[PDB]
Design a binder for this molecule. Structure first.
Ligand SMILES: CC(C)(COP(=O)(O)OP(=O)(O)OC[C@H]1O[C@@H](n2cnc3c(N)ncnc32)[C@H](O)[C@@H]1OP(=O)(O)O)[C@@H](O)C(=O)NCCC(=O)NCCS
Ligand SMILES: CC(C)(COP(=O)(O)OP(=O)(O)OC[C@H]1O[C@@H](n2cnc3c(N)ncnc32)[C@H](O)[C@@H]1OP(=O)(O)O)[C@@H](O)C(=O)NCCC(=O)NCCS
Lengths: 152, 151
C-alpha cells in the first residue's frame, strides 16, 4: 500500500474542493457537497483557523478519502476535544485501513494540540454499521439523542 | 419577564458563575468547578468568535445558561450551532427559561448564517425534561456516540 495521509494547509484549497467530491460520492449526496461550493477566500480562512482540521488520504496523487474535524476548546476546564464531523473513504478503496489511518493521524495531531479525547457521532441506519464497526473498535459506544432545531 | 444575553470578554466573573450553575443542574460540582481554567484562559475563549456563551438572568442573577460552538461548514458558506451544554437552576425550572435561551440562540445563529442548531441529549431519567424540550423544537434522531482516546 502506498498511502499518504495529509493535513490540508491554507495553501491547498484546491485539494479541499476535490475532497468535497469524495465526500459527495461516499455520502451519495453530491448536491450538498459540490452543488454550492464556497469561495476560495472562505475556504482558505477556514483552513487557517485555530480549530478546523482537514485530512486527506492520497494514493499516487489521487485523493481516495478524508476527514473533517473541529477542535473544541472547553470552558469548564483547560482542555480540548476534537469532533469528527465527516469521515469518508472512496468505495473502491474501502476495507484497506485508510479510515483507520486517518483517525490515527488525527490522534497524533490531537496529542500535539493537547486534546484529551476525540469523539464522533455515528448514524444508526443500514448504511452505517461499517462506520459503527469502525468506531466500536476505536472508542466506547453510548446511545444518545440528536435534535435538529431549525434557524430562520 | 426574562433577560437572556450573550457573555462578553470582560464578563469572566459571570462565566465562572455560570460554570457553577452547570455544576448543580448536572450534579457534578467538581468537573465544572473543581478545576476551573485561569482567568487569562477564559477570556481568550470568550474573545473567540466561534464560542457562544449565554446566561439567562431574572432579577440580576443566573437561572439558566448555555454554551455552544459555531461550526463553520466546509462544503458550503453556512454554519451550524452545536449546543454543548444547556442548564437551568432547579429552583426556577418549568418557567419557559430553556425555551428563551434557544430562541435567543436562533436569532444569533441567523446573524451568523447558521441554518441549524443541533444538541445532544443522553437517555438517563434525569434528562427527560431536556428530551421533552428538544423534541418540540426539532425533530429527533437516535444516533451513536463514540469517545476515542487520544492516548
Ligand atoms: C466508514 C468508512 C469510512 C470505513 O472506511 P475504511 O477505510 O474502509 O475502514 P477501514 O478499512 O480502516 O476498516 C477498519 C475496521 O473497521 C471495520 N470495518 C470497516 N468497514 C467494515 C465493514 N463494511 N463491515 C464490517 N466491518 C468494517 C473492520 O473491523 C475494519 O477492520 P478489518 O478490515 O481489519 O476487519 C467507509 O466505509 C465509508 O466511507 N463509508 C461511507 C461514509 C460513512 O459512513 N462515513 C462515516 C461518517 S462518521
Ligand atoms: C432541560 C431543562 C434545561 C429545561 O429547562 P426549563 O427551563 O425548565 O424548560 P422550559 O421551561 O423552557 O420548558 C419548555 C417545554 O419543554 C417541556 N418540558 C420542560 N420540562 C419538562 C419536564 N420535566 N417534563 C416534561 N416536559 C418538560 C415542556 O414541553 C415545556 O413546556 P411547558 O412547561 O409549557 O409544558 C432543565 O430541566 C435542566 O436544566 N435540566 C437539567 C440539565 C439537563 O438535562 N440539560 C440538558 C442537557 S445539556
Amino acid at each position: 500500500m502506498s498511502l499518504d495521509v495529509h493535513q490540508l494547509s491554507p495553501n491547498e484549497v484546491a485539494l479541499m474542493e476535490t475532497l468535497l467530491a469524495t465526500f459527495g460520492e461516499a455520502f451519495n449526496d453530491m448536491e450538498t457537497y459540490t452543488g454550492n461550493r464556497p469561495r476560495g477566500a472562505y475556504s482558505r480562512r477556514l483552513l487557517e483557523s485555530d480549530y478546523f482540521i482537514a485530512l486527506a488520504a492520497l494514493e499516487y496523487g489521487e485523493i481516495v478519502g478524508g476527514l473533517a474535524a473541529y477542535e473544541l476548546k472547553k470552558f469548564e476546564q483547560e482542555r480540548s476535544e476534537i469532533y469528527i464531523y465527516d469521515l469518508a473513504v472512496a468505495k473502491a478503496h474501502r476495507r484497506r485501513g485508510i479510515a483507520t489511518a486517518l483517525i490515527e493521524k488525527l490522534k497524533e495531531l490531537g496529542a500535539a494540540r493537547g486534546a484529551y479525547v476525540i469523539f464522533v457521532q455515528a448514524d444508526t441506519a443500514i448504511e452505517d454499521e461499517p462506520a459503527i464497526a469502525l468506531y466500536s473498535k476505536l472508542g466506547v459506544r453510548e446511545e444518545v439523542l440528536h435534535f435538529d432545531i431549525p434557524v430562520s
